[PDB]
Design an enzyme around this catalytic site. Structure first.
Site, short mmCIF file in Angstrom:
data_model
loop_
_atom_site.label_atom_id
_atom_site.label_comp_id
_atom_site.label_asym_id
_atom_site.label_seq_id
_atom_site.Cartn_x
_atom_site.Cartn_y
_atom_site.Cartn_z
N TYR B 17 11.69 22.85 132.52
CA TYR B 17 11.92 24.27 132.74
C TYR B 17 11.52 24.72 134.14
CZ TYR B 17 7.22 23.95 130.61
OH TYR B 17 5.94 23.58 130.26
N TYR B 25 8.49 22.43 135.70
CA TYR B 25 7.48 21.83 134.82
C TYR B 25 8.18 21.07 133.69
CZ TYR B 25 3.62 24.71 136.85
OH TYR B 25 2.66 25.29 137.66
N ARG B 47 0.58 16.37 139.17
CA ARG B 47 -0.27 16.28 137.98
C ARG B 47 0.54 15.85 136.76
NH1 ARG B 47 -5.12 17.90 135.65
NH2 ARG B 47 -5.05 19.07 133.67
N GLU B 70 -8.11 22.47 128.53
CA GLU B 70 -8.06 21.24 129.32
C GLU B 70 -9.43 20.75 129.78
OE1 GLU B 70 -5.02 21.65 132.40
OE2 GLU B 70 -3.56 21.43 130.77
#
Lengths: 177, 177
Positions: B17, B25, B47, B70
């Site tokens: 998207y 991402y 990442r 996270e």
């Protein structure tokens, strides 16, 4: 019962909802960027907050998402599905709020500095993450920018008083404030 | 195309998207409690993360909410509306990730301790909160528990390779891994 379709349908709505554990929370979409809330049960029963700035969007017809972060460091992502009388909330609590929730049990607006001091002084990790559905038991059309909706600390029978039509007048205001 | 109606319809789906700023991402619902993701543009381009534990629910028919936190301290609440090729994500970044995003630009699974060390060493507040919609440009049915989907660092033309059918074989696996 009205059908929610637009962002405007949602804004100005005053909600009370119950989680599976019986805890009762209360929340008001005051305008397109501001929320007020009040906690009746559980870990932080007694806490209330006004003028919390938030991101408020319609995800799709009748589904609304609210994102905010608190003076305590807590992150919140709330999703309302009012046509199904359902809410899903995820609260990401800093460790210190899990350890000492009573510190957050106050009218936060008068104690912002204390919240900020606490979040720097105490532990942040590991976070307590609470993703839960709730059933909506009350939806009132308060209109937007109604400062009476959440304007005092919770008391025992307050949700009943609200649902029974004993709390607000005909214009969704408090007779005595 | 297929219509998403159940949680099972959603699980095993591999998404790419794009946000309004052009950042791309990539995210994969590996199973009912696990997500993998990979970042192609912006702040933390490079990442990637596998085996992130997450809460995954269906809010209502065809609408899905994912919540996680996270090793860096970042909180994430993602809402997928795949029938409308739309996503809404809120990311709550600790201050240190905004200040030093490059620290998080790695295969996180090999550097968990470093992320945890950083989140205690550096500043948490004020948080950078990023609530935005993205347009979904790719949806693939990878099946569940497919370890090939996100199994290497991103490279420049990777999203194009995936969308063009050049990355995965007929069984959604990598020919050479």
């Amino acid at each position: 019962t009205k059908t929610f379709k637009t962002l405007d349908d949602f804004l100005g709505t005053h909600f009370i909802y119950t989680f599976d554990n019986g805890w009762e929370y209360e929340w008001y979409a005051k305008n397109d960027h501001t929320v007020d809330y009040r906690i009746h049960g559980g870990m932080v029963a007694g806490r209330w907050v006004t003028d919390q700035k938030a991101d408020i969007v319609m995800l799709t017809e009748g589904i609304y998402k609210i994102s905010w972060t608190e003076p305590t460091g807590t992150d919140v992502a709330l999703d309302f599905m009012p046509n199904e009388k359902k809410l899903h909330g995820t609260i990401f609590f800093p460790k210190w709020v899990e350890e000492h929730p009573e510190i957050t049990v106050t009218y936060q607006n008068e104690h912002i500095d204390l919240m900020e001091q606490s979040r720097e002084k105490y532990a942040t990790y590991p976070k307590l993450v609470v993703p839960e559905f709730a059933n909506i038991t009350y939806m009132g059309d308060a209109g937007q920018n109604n400062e009476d909706v959440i304007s005092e600390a919770p008391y025992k029978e307050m949700p009943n008083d609200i649902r029974n039509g004993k709390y607000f007048d005909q214009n969704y205001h408090r007779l005595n404030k």
